[PDB]
Amino acid sequence: PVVGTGASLSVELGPGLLTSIYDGIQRPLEVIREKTGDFIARGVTAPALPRDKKWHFIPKAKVGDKVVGGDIIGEVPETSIIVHKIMVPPGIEGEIVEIAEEGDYTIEEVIAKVKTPSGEIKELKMYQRWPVRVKRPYKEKLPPEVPLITGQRVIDTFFPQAKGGTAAIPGPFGSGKTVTQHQLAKWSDAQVVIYIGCGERGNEMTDVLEEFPKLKDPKTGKPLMERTVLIANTSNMPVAAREASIYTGITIAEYFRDMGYDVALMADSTSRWAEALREISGPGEEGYPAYLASKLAEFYERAGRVVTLGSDYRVGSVSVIGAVSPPGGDFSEPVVQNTLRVVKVFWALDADLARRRHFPAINWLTSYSLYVDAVKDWWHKNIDPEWKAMRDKAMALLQKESELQEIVRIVGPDALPERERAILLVARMLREDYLQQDAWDEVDTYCPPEKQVTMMRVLLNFYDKTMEAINRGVPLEEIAKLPVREEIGRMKFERDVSKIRSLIDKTNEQFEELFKKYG
């Protein structure tokens, strides 16, 4: 229902992308013009990558080296965090005949010449151009297998994102109702963040214009912008550029994955229109809803972990987290349905949970991840052989709690058996001691994989001992008051995993005494 491609719409890709703040068409901040329709339009002002800046170029190749598209011919330290890798653009191959020496150069300088097989000489710069609407090529899209570690317990355990995977999360990123969205940006083990911030004037002038060039990258000490590219998506810009933005972003992200980096693309969305600008502008025309659904599907299809172009075996990824914000908070709308149809992960940020101050406000019954089986082996091999068994078991606990609560909604709690009360006690411990995480605490703001599984073992072991105890006639009141219980509640604030781990033996001992006091 749109039978056409484009009219030359591209991005520049080379040193100077980091720290930059662009609009939907890679044009720097405060530069204001128009665009419309299916093909190109007009412009005048700004250049994408700084033309005056001097970048330090370390050569990686020597005259006589055979190269191919994607081969790394030099290094440029772009920020204190990120070394930029200079790449033979895709579709170019041959022998290096001319290569720059260790030196300082602007991005327009030729740093290499490549004699193609037929004899043609090609001139290479530190940057390249790429049409945002064609996916940058690669050798092989690898199947989902390694998780993107966010350090958020509820996500990493129950609703994992794979590196190169696709995830959706409710509402605008700028919501002050939740901080998980920000945790994702700063703690995910992607080296580079491509952020598409969509900010509507009101309670937010923009998606904090100044706090971002001041927000700390907690992994290094330097600011997050030194490993970030910000694309702004505001109301004061043409709706055509807003539309183009996620293609600008993902192309840039693909470019970084091509270097061997893991990249996280976060695409913000707003309660703006949906039904406006559709079938009829405002049948007569033709059926149309389906078409843009597949346009969005193809965009999400551009996420992935790849073997990159190049002579060396090299892997990079683009992981996509897309915000979802339906016109009336309906979540039956088209925007939600279309997105949820292609994404493999949905993290159900939940108002009721936020109201109750259960943080990470992620609803553990309505969230999902189709990557669980895909990542289990990474967990089993590197972290804990029982990872998968332990999460399934914990989810079963939470499912059971849910069913029990529904019945208690109908008959009250008075006829609850000790067993059911025991399940509720441990499900409560799961919710409070594991699902909940303190984003504001210097220790609990991030939870290494190692600590995640140890915390889960402590809890599941308390569960086993509890059900055993109940099977031996130990009253639940005694168990509810076991001293270790209170220690288990505070383990998320412990930095030393071995002290956490020791809660296991301590749990075992306390229950043994309880077996001495009864049997």
UniProtKB/Swiss-Prot annotation:
CDD domains: ATP-synt_V_A-type_alpha_C (cd18111), ATP-synt_V_A-type_alpha_N (cd18119), Hint (cd00081), V_A-ATPase_A (cd01134). This is A-type ATP synthase subunit A. It is found in: Cell membrane. GO terms for molecular function: ATP binding; endonuclease activity; proton-transporting ATP synthase activity, rotational mechanism; proton-transporting ATPase activity, rotational mechanism. Has multiple subunits with at least A(3), B(3), C, D, E, F, H, I and proteolipid K(x). Component of the A-type ATP synthase that produces ATP from ADP in the presence of a proton gradient across the membrane. The A chain is the catalytic subunit. Its main location: membrane. Pfam families: ATP-synt_ab, ATP-synt_ab_N, ATP-synt_ab_Xtn, ATP-synt_VA_C, Intein_splicing. It catalyses: ATP + H2O + 4 H(+)(in) = ADP + phosphate + 5 H(+)(out). Gene3D superfamilies: 2.40.30.20, 2.40.50.100, Bovine Mitochondrial F1-atpase, Atp Synthase Beta Chain, Chain D, domain 3, Hedgehog/Intein (Hint) domain, Homing endonucleases, P-loop containing nucleotide triphosphate hydrolases. It is a peripheral membrane protein. InterPro entries: ATP-synt_VA_C, ATP-synth_a_Xtn, ATP_synth_asu-like_sf, ATPase_a/bsu_AS, ATPase_F1/V1/A1_a/bsu_N, ATPase_F1/V1/A1_a/bsu_N_sf, ATPase_F1/V1/A1_a/bsu_nucl-bd, ATPase_F1/V1_b/a_C. HAMAP family: ATP_synth_A_arch. The gene is atpA. This protein undergoes a protein self splicing that involves a post-translational excision of the VDE intervening region (intein) followed by peptide ligation. Keywords: ATP synthesis, ATP-binding, Autocatalytic cleavage, Cell membrane, Endonuclease, Hydrogen ion transport, Hydrolase, Intron homing, Ion transport, Membrane, Nuclease, Nucleotide-binding, Protein splicing, Translocase, Transport. GO terms for cellular component: plasma membrane. It comes from the Archaea. The lineage of its organism: Archaea, Methanobacteriati, Methanobacteriota, Thermococci, Thermococcales. The intein interrupts the ATP-binding site. Belongs to the ATPase alpha/beta chains family. Its EC number is 7.1.2.2, 3.1.-.-. One of its GO terms (biological process) is intron homing. It comes from Pyrococcus horikoshii (strain ATCC 700860 / DSM 12428 / JCM 9974 / NBRC 100139 / OT-3).
